[PDB]
Amino acid sequence: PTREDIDRKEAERLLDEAFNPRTKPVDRKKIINSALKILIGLYKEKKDDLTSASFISIARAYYLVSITILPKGTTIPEKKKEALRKGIEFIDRAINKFNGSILDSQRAFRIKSVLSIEFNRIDREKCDNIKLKNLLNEAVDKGCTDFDTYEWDIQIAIRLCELGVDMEGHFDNLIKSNKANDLQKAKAYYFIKKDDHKAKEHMDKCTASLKYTPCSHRLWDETVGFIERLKGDSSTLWRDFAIKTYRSCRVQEKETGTLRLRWYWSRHRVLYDMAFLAVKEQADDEEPDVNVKQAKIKKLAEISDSLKSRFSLRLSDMEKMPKSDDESNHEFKKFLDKCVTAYQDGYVINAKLLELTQVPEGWVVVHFYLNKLEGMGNAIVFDKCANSWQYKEFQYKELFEVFLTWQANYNLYKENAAEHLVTLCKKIGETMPFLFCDNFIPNGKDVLFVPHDFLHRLPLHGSIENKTNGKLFLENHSCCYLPAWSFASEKEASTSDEYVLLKNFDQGHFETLQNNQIWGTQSVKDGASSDDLENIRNNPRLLTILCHGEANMSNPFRSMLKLANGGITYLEILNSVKGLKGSQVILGACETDLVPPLSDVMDEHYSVATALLLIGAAGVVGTMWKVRSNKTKSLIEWKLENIEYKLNEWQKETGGAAYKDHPPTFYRSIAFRSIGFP
Amino acid sequence: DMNITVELTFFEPYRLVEWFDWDARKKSHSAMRGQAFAQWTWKGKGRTAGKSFITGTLVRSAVIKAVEELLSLNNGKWEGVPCCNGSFQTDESKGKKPSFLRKRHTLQWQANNKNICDKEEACPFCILLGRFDNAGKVHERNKDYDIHFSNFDLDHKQEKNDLRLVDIASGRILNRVDFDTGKAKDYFRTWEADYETYGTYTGRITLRNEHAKKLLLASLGFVDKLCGALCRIEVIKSEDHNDELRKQAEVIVEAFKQNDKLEKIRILADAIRTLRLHGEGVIEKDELPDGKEERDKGHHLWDIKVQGTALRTKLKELWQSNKDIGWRKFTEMLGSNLYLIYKKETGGVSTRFRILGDTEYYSKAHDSEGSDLFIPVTPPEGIETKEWIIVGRLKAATPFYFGVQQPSDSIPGKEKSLVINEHTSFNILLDKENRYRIPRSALRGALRRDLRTAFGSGCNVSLGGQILCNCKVCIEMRRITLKDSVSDFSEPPEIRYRIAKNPGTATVEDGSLFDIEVGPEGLTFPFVLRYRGHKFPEQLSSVIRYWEENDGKNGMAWLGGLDSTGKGRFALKDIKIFEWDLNQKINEYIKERGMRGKEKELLEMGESSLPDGLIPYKFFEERECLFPYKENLKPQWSEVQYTIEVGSPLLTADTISALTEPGNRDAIAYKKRVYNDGNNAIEPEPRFAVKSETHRGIFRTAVGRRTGDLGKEDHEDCTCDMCIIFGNEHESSKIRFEDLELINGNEFEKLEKHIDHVAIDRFTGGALDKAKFDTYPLAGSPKKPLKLKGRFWIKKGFSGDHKLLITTALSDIRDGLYPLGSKGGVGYGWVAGISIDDNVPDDFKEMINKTEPINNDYVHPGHQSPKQDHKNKNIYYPHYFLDSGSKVYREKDIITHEEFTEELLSGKINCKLETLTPLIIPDTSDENGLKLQGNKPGHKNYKFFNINGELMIPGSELRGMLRTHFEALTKSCFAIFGEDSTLSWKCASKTLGGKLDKALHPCTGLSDGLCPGCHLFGTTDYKGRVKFGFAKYENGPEWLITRGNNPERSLTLGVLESPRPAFSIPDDESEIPGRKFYLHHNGWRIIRQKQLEIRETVQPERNVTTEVMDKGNVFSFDVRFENLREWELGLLLQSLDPGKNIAHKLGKGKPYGFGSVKIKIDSLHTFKINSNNDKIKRVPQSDIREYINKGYQKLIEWSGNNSIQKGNVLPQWHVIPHIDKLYKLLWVPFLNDSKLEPDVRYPVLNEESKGYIEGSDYTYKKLGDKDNLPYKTRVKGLTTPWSPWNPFQ
RNA sequence: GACUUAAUGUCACGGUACCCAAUUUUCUGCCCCG
Ligand SMILES: [Zn+2]
Ligand SMILES: [Zn+2]
Ligand SMILES: [Zn+2]
Ligand SMILES: [Zn+2]
């Protein structure tokens, strides 16, 4: 016993304390660093005279360093790859330093195999499948088959079964082992014995187990990867696996409170897309019963709404969140620590919501979904008077190109991009021809749109029919918008007769609006600090906020209305503002100042209108882009004269059907939008 | 069908990349990022030579972009011929994709040709694109091309053999910084090529149509940017020296390794680098420093033997063998080689551990799923397009720093490891002619940061992108063009040094030293900016007015890379804005090429000689009208200016200038170099300052001790208070510091003062040999103080408790707990005050303006022998020894300086000092003094100690006196003990370090504990907890007058010969008899009367003349203490004033009776700053009595005698034996108005000598041998105090 | 002429070598017997 063995045994004690599941992560990050300090000191002392055991301990410590680095953003960080590369380069020296015991050769090949499996999962072109297959066959030749004592042998066996080599000799020891979880048993049955009944049973137990684990776990990623492989192999079980995994994800996500959040993991969207495709392929099959087909189209709408509820903030934005409201800050910190603890534990060991059919009479509801997997777009219509469901499909590529063209031209030449606006409206009318036919959307009905991602920015109410003298959509129907179906509620509070105005900016002038006497309450003011917003108390019938806006391009909880002494953000609206039950709100800021511009097809970014809807306001009327101030003053005066009249009448009267002769008046009319469903 | 010969000239350094074909390009990352650069191909093998070229497709894309812009300016027309909007889309089903895909927007216009273009007749745009040609996308013969771009070869003027890559390019590392954290995310590498020698390329363009020829010749001049540099397109008709120095550096390091002195090599490295600031004569005239008092040692560093000769002769020989490469390259090469060998050999330097390294990242390709997006952009018809040019100069307001990788770590051929070994020496970015350089990347990143602050919102920059970002910052930044700047200055930079401080021991940590290279302040760089657009923004005007300095407002351009220590604050001077109208004056822009490269002529041009079309711009908005200003840019950083008033000498060491500059000085103050712009050189006089890192660390220690955060051993992933204010390895700091500059240093005469110090051996009483040292501080006095002006900056977003912390740190610097510089325990650098300028924000003003007898009565029973006779017939001996035996108590739980503990005490004592006998404290800088040495040559005469004509006593004298008293009281070890050579009387036994017991040796290290004296006053590994200040004269008479004397002051003393320890140890037994003390008597009367006798009859080389002070003078001084227990404070207050009839001894002439002083404790203040408020008490008489009682009980407990009772009575110190002997040695007989006064004098050596005065038998012949007294009774007579020596007892 | 480009499509002026670390702790310019 020299001091090399004493220091190695101390470092091994520290690593065995770090491999314990009862340890919090903030202690693990210190324990691993102490152990690596001792071992790298021994290496700097005895550079090539080191035994194989210290090299094995260094490789294990670098595996722990690799699993303690959390991904930020949507990219695997380079620190993870650097840790796995250094561990491989350290254990290769113990492999090439021969003349040890056979047990130490077994241990070295086991550590090299698990580091290579993780590095092949992260990076593909650096560590390909052929190299991994050769290394794993070499590791299983040395006798790494003890399925009762180590679970890393189970991982090696299942990964080799996935890569395609025969493993029929080890099946009985694989099944009878009590370290294996149920996904590994289902993979073993399907890939070796070709038995689908036992695979079906073990996968059902796996999903019922997934109902209680957080979404930061490894098991979610592995399960969705198995369903993707089953769909690629043209099996007949991925249809039934996808729906159960979707149900488990819904029940697990239900537990969070009113602050709508979910953990970002990369295979969420492919799970919802495969569930949508499974229910759609069941629905297009012919059946003599029609009620089953109605139930399947309703299931499609439910999957779409459950995707559109939350918005999935990233990790660095969650770590940089401001500290206030010591109970809600406590809820957020509890959520974050639960997610990080589940992420590491996977690697160390192994009001009411309305029904979809609850709509007032004479209404028609249209849901949207953009399927990235098949590259298509689905529109789902519900009709209340006939009580029927239908759905149609369309393409979305050239629509995206025309929208990006209008975005660039607007951001340079705001009022002179009007011809590109007219071209975008004609393109919406050409790609989606179903909303002008009488079978899909009936004549004279009120339409509620629940859009998906880049359809949140398109003007759907100003589409033009693909004819010679085309008509607009707002000439026959009255349109309303909603971010998701979960934001709808009831009890439209029409209590008071109060009128309130607030105003902070003095660029576009509103003095003729300011001098009116209808703003007779003492709550009205023209300085507009945030505490002036948090002191309204008696639920006014109309509130009018007139200020500028500012958008945070990562965190939607930091988008602010530019009021006095710092403004008021999304989170402060959700925590502080109370007296707005059943209040029509008219914003003065445009939508382009409150949301950032999009650079991808998918975007989830909710403005302050959704926070005003969650506080309890009955409807926000806003501008989608920057209009002259005279139009906003005209809208506010028309709303004061008539609070019970619909917006599309005013859009038809003041020049909304003038796209042929004067595109500026058409630009100024169709900018206005109502974001609240009764 | 005629050909065109084209030249391409650069005006900035361009980029270079290696040539791969198409598929080997996809195998590499740097080649895929490095498209649209200049390509490099090798020649032969060995990868050392090759050639550079620019492809024709790159020039074709540049000309196509220029033609599109020119056709968009005139709405689709050029000289009356119209044109369609081309074609930029390719179908995949018919033909392949053209090997380079477009992501940006394309400009379009309303097509008014009304004839569809075909092969028969086509517009100029379709000819220049080459649609209706032959030879599409698979190459054939060079005919059947309507337009052809050939490759562009380097026009080398010495194309004789080959070009090396190291002779054209230079490697560099760029960066990407997060906006919130201030830290970098990733990095990447480029090759930058020289433009002064290798910047002309020559090619050939073939055209077969005139209809395109007019537009092509127009659009070759509109190209402004190629390969990363501004360009202009015209149409015409020593490794062997490194190897030798590396071998010699290995020889030097091996010699230093053999002499067991390796750690000096690091110091030596930077010493040689500092030699580039001097001439070569310092190695040829031997102007290096020498040992001031050497017999064998020589210098501390320049006289180490290397292969049988000294180091200075070795350096002279190495310079005599390498005269061809110059002096500067010689010094830099030898310093770099020494540092690299030291870093190789040291290896594990036990600093920050740093696993896992750092990350490169190049932007990933678009191989999956594609994007065939085509985005047309149409400007409106009556729009106006203009181009603005801003010219000016950039002036450094502080030192600056632009980082660079180490040379021999960035070689463009062969770039450069399981463990991580980070460097500790950093360099600055220079050009090839050794000129300073502000790179384009630093300016562009700073402009992006300030524009994101001014807009209020911006994105983080994404790299792998298919759609361009449409945030406002990116839209405005796609129109700004800058230009790299170089100075007209080539002098070498300065090296600035930094250490770390261990917070428990308050000493320096080993291996924590690092250094940077900084450039001078006052330098000027050129500055050009160009903006091409439709209207000039308000946010760019706000950033320009923020960077610009005027009267009152100073500049705020934080470029560079060490901003937390205040490095890289520039200002913008002499701005001029000019305007091009491109819709009417496009031909003059083409003719003058946009003044590219001629921007230096625009700064000196009058308004009359401007080119046609360029007008001055006069609608430039003022500072108090811009709304991005006053709301986002002005409240960002807030300034606090103040002035420190220091009333003590100030010493902040340099430690390299003491080894380079001549004068053999040990510790000298810190200086700077300042560039002036009236003339064009550095200023001849240098400027004294205290560095920014020093008072940054002062504020950090002051905050961390009150919050209690310095005790934590780890600071990664932390969110404590001092990691929020001062930052860590993950976040940048919120507080930025600048230097403290001396402002009143012109009303002094002889600003630097020489102060010399020595250590006194405890046994022999004289100076320990070869421990003399010197200091040269700045002369601070209590009536002429130093005034230092300083400044720091606070960021917006600070809470109330953090501002309370910073104001409490400022109040603690004002109160005097943190002295500046070195040697604070002996009184150097004590703050007397802080003044705050009236531009400071009002919250700091109110928060700083809101935080605004003892007698002992113990009388000692003196010795009976000088009290019974009272006729003065006895003669005593002047020095006696004290002997407590061997037991010393060593505590191993040492009190730390990490925090202010609650149970302990801290405060200050004000004391007054009164003289009972005359006092001599000499000013031993001036050896000639006051009396002329022309007459009686060799006669040393001195003056009293004075700083600026004010009589003072140094703090080191007071500290040594009280330390010797405390060590004799508390039974501590010998702190300063000379283990000298073998004592004689034949050669006797082992040396006198071996005569001493092992327990009384000095404390070395913190493992075996610390004695009470070393625990209170300090050691080499532990800072003390008491600080003694300088004493100022305040009252009383002065200048003891004597009649017949050339000054009326200035007594001439007797001889003072070295002490001989063979009188106390006169055999091989009879060990070291303890410490040595002197008695209190009036021998100065017999010196003063016999002046004429000793001015004659002695040799005047053995004598010393010095000024004296009379009895009755009052001095005043202060003692400051932190983290003390109750018994330590009690024993300290007892050791200051030990009662009536007890007094101390101080100064020169202690055997003759000079210098008996008495200290009275005037006041005692305490504070407990971890309470609710930082208060100050007064500590009345009862509490100090209880403290002294606690100290007395601790002393009884150490003695062990449990017979003495405990009670609330006054202590009697004479019940302990050694306290009784010590207080017998310090008893004054003439104070209680008794008529008796003793006679104290040495024997006079075998009479028939000079002073005998009677037949007294008081010679060393009779007191010497073992016949009148044996040896043991001599040691017994030396050991018992106040015993008579005539007659003997 | 090759080394050395492919042509109806190159935002690399698309990326600050950046972030943390008091040149200092200890020492009376002092002293009588061969
Ligand atoms: Zn054409
Ligand atoms: Zn951007
Ligand atoms: Zn901390
Ligand atoms: Zn000691």
3-state secondary structure of B390: strand
Is B887 part of a structural domain of the chain?
Answer: no
Is beta strand A584-590 parallel, antiparallel or unpaired with respect to A619-623?
A: parallel
Partners of B674 in beta bridges: B521
Amino acid at A640: L
Residue A98 lies in a domain: yes
Experimentally determined by:
cryo-EM
Residue B650 pairs in a beta bridge with B778
Nucleotides of C under 7 A from a protein CB: 3-34
Question: Which of A26, A404, A554 minimises the CB distance to B373?
Answer: A404
Q: Protein B826 CA to nucleic acid C28 C1', in Å? A: 11
Strand C close residues, chain B 495-514, CB < 7 angstroms = 497-501, 506-508, 512-514
Tell me the three state secondary structure of residue B80.
Answer: coil
Q: How far apart are CA B1069 and CA B164, in angstroms?
A: 80
| Residue with token string 């001989």 | B1060
DSSP 3-state assignment of B479? coil
Q: State the distance from the centre of ligand 3 to the C-alpha of B734, rounded, in angstroms.
A: 14
| Number of neighbouring beta carbons within 10 Å of residue B1062 | 10
DSSP H helical ranges for B1112-1180: 1126-1136
The residue type of B689 is A
Residue A566 and residue A447 share a domain: no
Q: Are residues B232 and B248 in the same domain?
A: no
How far apart, in whole angstroms, are the C-alpha atoms of residue B796 and residue B627?
18
Which residue among B1178, B1203, B1231 closes a domain?
Answer: B1231
B419 at interface of A, judged by CB pairs closer than 8 A: yes
B728 Cα–ligand 3 center, Å? 8
Q: Which chain A residues touch B380 with a CB distance below 8 Å?
A: 413, 416
| Domain count of the fold of chain B | 5
Contact status, residue B147 vs residue B127, Cβ threshold 8 Å: yes
Burial class (CB in 10 A: 0-12, 13-18, 19+), A73: middle
The tokens describing B568, both together, are 């890289």
- Helix and strand element counts for chain B (H, E): 30, 54
In three-state form (DSSP H/G/I as H, E/B as E, the rest C), the secondary structure along B1078-1109 is: ECCCCCHHHHHHCHHHHHCCCCCCCCEEECCE
Task: Match 């979910």 to its residue by tokens.
Answer: A262
CA distances to A317, B48, B374, B386, B440 from B470, in Å: 21, 45, 16, 22, 23
CA distance B719 to A223: 38
Separation between Cα atoms, residue A521 and residue A500, nearest integer Å: 7
| β-bridge partners, B742 | B788
Asked whether residue A320 falls in the same domain as residue A381, the answer is: no
Structure tokens at B1183: 């509490």
Nucleotide nearest to B371 (CA to C1'): C9
CA distances to A659, B594, B613, B927, B1213 from B591, in Å: 45, 8, 11, 78, 103
Q: What are phi and psi of B148, to 5 degrees?
A: -140, 125
Same domain (yes/no): B405, B335: no
Give yes or no: residues B434 and B523 share one domain: yes
The B 1114-1173 residues near strand C by Cβ under 7 Å are 1145-1151
Distance (Å, whole) CA B428 – CA B492: 10
With CA of B559 and C1' of each nucleotide, the nearest comes out as C16
Residues whose CB is less than 8 angstroms from the CB of residue A664 and which lie 6 or more positions away in sequence, other chains included:
A415, A418
Domain identity same for A285 and A372 = no
Q: Which of A296, A317, A350 is the last residue of a domain?
A: A350
B 340-369 residues inside an 8 A Cβ radius of A: 347-348, 353, 355-357, 359-361
Host domain of residue B823:
637-849
Could you write out the three-class secondary structure of A179-235? CCCHHHHHHHHHHHHCCHHHHHHHHHHHHHHHCCCCCCCHHHHHHHHHHHHHHHCCC
Residue of B nearest to A74 (CA): B462
CA-based nearest residue to A466, from A438, A494, A425: A425
Q: Are B372 and B530 in contact (CB under 8 A)?
A: no
Q: What are the b/e assignments for A614-630, b being 16+ CB within 10 Å?
A: bbbbbbbbbbbbebeee
A174 and A150 in contact (C-beta within 8 Å)? no
Q: Do B946 and B832 sit in the same domain of this protein?
A: no
Q: Do A89 and B374 touch (CB under 8 A)?
A: no
Q: How many CA atoms lie within 13 A of B793 on its CB side?
A: 21
| Residue B51 shares a structural domain with residue B25 | yes
Tell me whether residue A20 is in a domain: yes
- CA-nearest of B1041, B1054, B1284, B1266 to B1150 is B1054
Q: Are A223 and A245 a contacting pair, CB within 8 Å? A: yes
Q: Which amino acid makes up residue B43?
A: K
Q: Are residues A441 and A322 in the same domain?
A: no
Query: Beta strands B671-672 and B637-646: pairing type?
Result: unpaired
Domain end (from A452, A481, A510): A481
Q: State the alpha helices, DSSP H only, in B1119-1259.
A: 1126-1136, 1181-1199, 1217-1225
Domain stop point among B849, B883, B913: B849
How far, in Å, CA of A89 to CA of A55, rounded? 10
- Residue that is last in its domain, among A448, A481, A514: A481
Burial of A241 (0-12, 13-18, 19+ CB in 10 A): buried
Instruction: Please report whether residue A658 resides in a domain.
Output: no
**A504 and A639 share one domain:** yes
A611-to-A329, A481, A567, A568 alpha-carbon distances in Å = 18, 15, 15, 12
Rounded to whole angstroms, the Cα distance separating A249 from A237 reads 19
Beta bridge partners of residue B1121, listed in sequence order: B907, B1026
Same-domain check for residues A451 and A541: no
Answer yes or no: do B470 and A89 touch at CB < 8 A: no
Look at the block and give the residue holding tokens 């907890």: B1025
Identity of the residue numbered B722 = M
Q: Helix (H) and strand (E) counts for chain A? A: 26, 12
Strand (E) positions, B140-228? Answer: 147-149, 152-154, 163-164, 169-173, 176-177, 184-186, 189-193, 200-207, 225-226
Q: How many residues does chain A have?
A: 678
User: How many domains does chain A divide into?
Assistant: 4
Tell me the C-alpha distance between A497 and A515, whole Å. Answer: 19
Residue at A152 is within a domain: no
> From residues 906-925 of B, which are strand C contacts by CB within 7 A?
921-922, 924
Query: How many Å from the CA of B339 to C1' of C24?
Result: 23
| CA distances, A29 to each of A25, A66, A445, A657 (Å) | 6, 11, 61, 65
Strands A363-371 and A446-450: parallel
Is A411 within 8 Å of B467 when comparing Cβ atoms? no
Q: Are residues B480 and B571 in the same domain?
A: yes
DSSP code of residue A539: -
Residue A558 in any domain: the answer is yes
The length of chain B is 1289
- CB nearest B357 (choices: A26, A30, A82): A82
Of B335, B307, B325, nearest in space to B246 by CA:
B335
CA angle at B869 for the pair B868 and B871, rounded to the nearest 5°: 145
**Which residues in chain A touch residue B462, judged by CB atoms under 8 angstroms apart?**
599
SS3 for B269-304, per residue?
Answer: HHHHHHHHHCCCHHHHCCCCCCCCCCCCCCCCCCCC
Same domain, A93 and A125: yes
CB < 7 Å to strand C — which of 420-439 in chain B? 424, 439
Q: Token match 């200050």: residue?
A: B908
Claim to verify: residue B532 and residue B614 sit in the same structural domain: yes
Tokens of A395: 């393409």
> Are the beta carbons of B911 and B1117 closer than 8 angstroms?
yes
Rounded distance, CA B806 to CA B792, Å? 11
Separation of CA B712 and ligand 3 centre (Å): 7
B1272 lies in a domain? no
- For the stretch A37-58, what's the b/e string if a residue is b when 16 or more beta carbons lie within 10 angstroms of its beta carbon? ebbbebbeeeeeebbbbbbbbb
- Residues A24, A106, single domain; the answer is yes
> Is B799 part of a structural domain of the chain?
yes
Task: Verify that B390 and B299 share a domain, yes or no.
Answer: no
Residues A366, A381 contacting (CB under 8 angstroms): yes
Nearest to B303 by CA among B322, B317, B290: B290
Are the beta carbons of A33 and B355 separated by less than 8 Å?
Answer: yes
DSSP code at position B650: B
Q: What is the DSSP string of A268-305?
A: HHHHHHHHHHHHHHHHSS--S-SHHHHHHHHHHHHHHH
Residues A431 and A567 reside in one and the same domain: no
The residue whose two tokens read 């033997």 is B305
DSSP one-letter string for B20-33: --SHHHHT-SHHHH
Secondary structure of B998-1044 in the HEC alphabet? HHHCCCCCCCCCECHHHHHHCECCECCCEEECCEEEEECCCCCCCCC
Query: What is the CA B832 to C1' C13 distance in angstroms?
Result: 53
Query: Whose structure tokens read 């004597």?
Result: B1042
Rounded Cα distance, A658 and A665, in Å:
7
Q: Are residues B164 and B64 in the same domain?
A: yes
Substitution target from B178, B187, B470, B475 for chain A, most A beta carbons within 10 A: B470
- How distant is the alpha carbon of residue B14 from its chain centre? 36
**Where do breaks (C to N over 2.5 Å) occur in chain B, by preceding residue number?**
237, 416, 852, 985
Domain that residue A290 falls in: 211-350
In the numeric block, which tokens belong to residue B652?
């902040």
**Dist. CA B508–CA B1022, nearest whole Å:** 10
> Per the omega criterion (within 30 degrees of 0), is the bond before B1238 cis?
no
Does residue B205 sit in the same domain as residue B250? no
- Residue A156 neighbours by CB under 8 Å, 6+ apart: A110, A113, A114, A117, A136, A139, A140, A144
For residue B854, being part of any structural domain is answered with: no
A561 and A598 part of one domain: yes
State whether A402 and A505 are in the same domain: no
Residue B841 in tokens = 């924000």
Which of A283, A201, A214, A284 lies closest to A244 in space, CA to CA?
A201
Of B373, B374, B377, the CB nearest to A412: B377
Establish if B522 belongs to a structural domain.
Answer: yes
Contacts of B236 (CB under 8 A, 6+ apart): B5, B6, B7
Question: Which of B1016, B977, B1029, B962 has its CA nearest to residue B1194?
Answer: B1016
Residues B47 and B130 reside in one and the same domain: yes
Q: How far: B1013 CA to C19 C1' (Å)?
A: 43
Residue in B with minimal Cα distance to A27: B717
Q: Does residue A381 share a domain with residue A311?
A: no
Burial of B414 (0-12, 13-18, 19+ CB in 10 A): exposed
Residue A189 lies in a domain: no
Distances (CA, A) of A191 to A137, A176, B566, B697, B1099: 17, 17, 65, 65, 113
Q: Do B232 and B253 belong to one domain?
A: no
User: Are the C-beta atoms of B701 and B503 separated by less than 8 Å?
Assistant: yes
Q: Is A436 inside a domain boundary?
A: yes
Q: Residue B880: name the closest of B1288, B1287, B1274 by CA.
A: B1274
Q: Is residue A397 part of a domain?
A: yes
Nearest CA to B12 out of B403, B540, B441 is that of B441
Q: Which of B604, B625, B646 is the last residue of a domain?
A: B625
End-to-end CA, chain A: 80
Q: Which of B180, B356, B457 sits opposite A320 (nearest CB)?
A: B180
Burial class (CB in 10 A: 0-12, 13-18, 19+), B838: exposed
Reading the block at residue A411, the tokens are 């951001």
Return all residues near B1219 (Cβ < 8 A) that are at least 6 apart.
Answer: B969, B1195, B1213
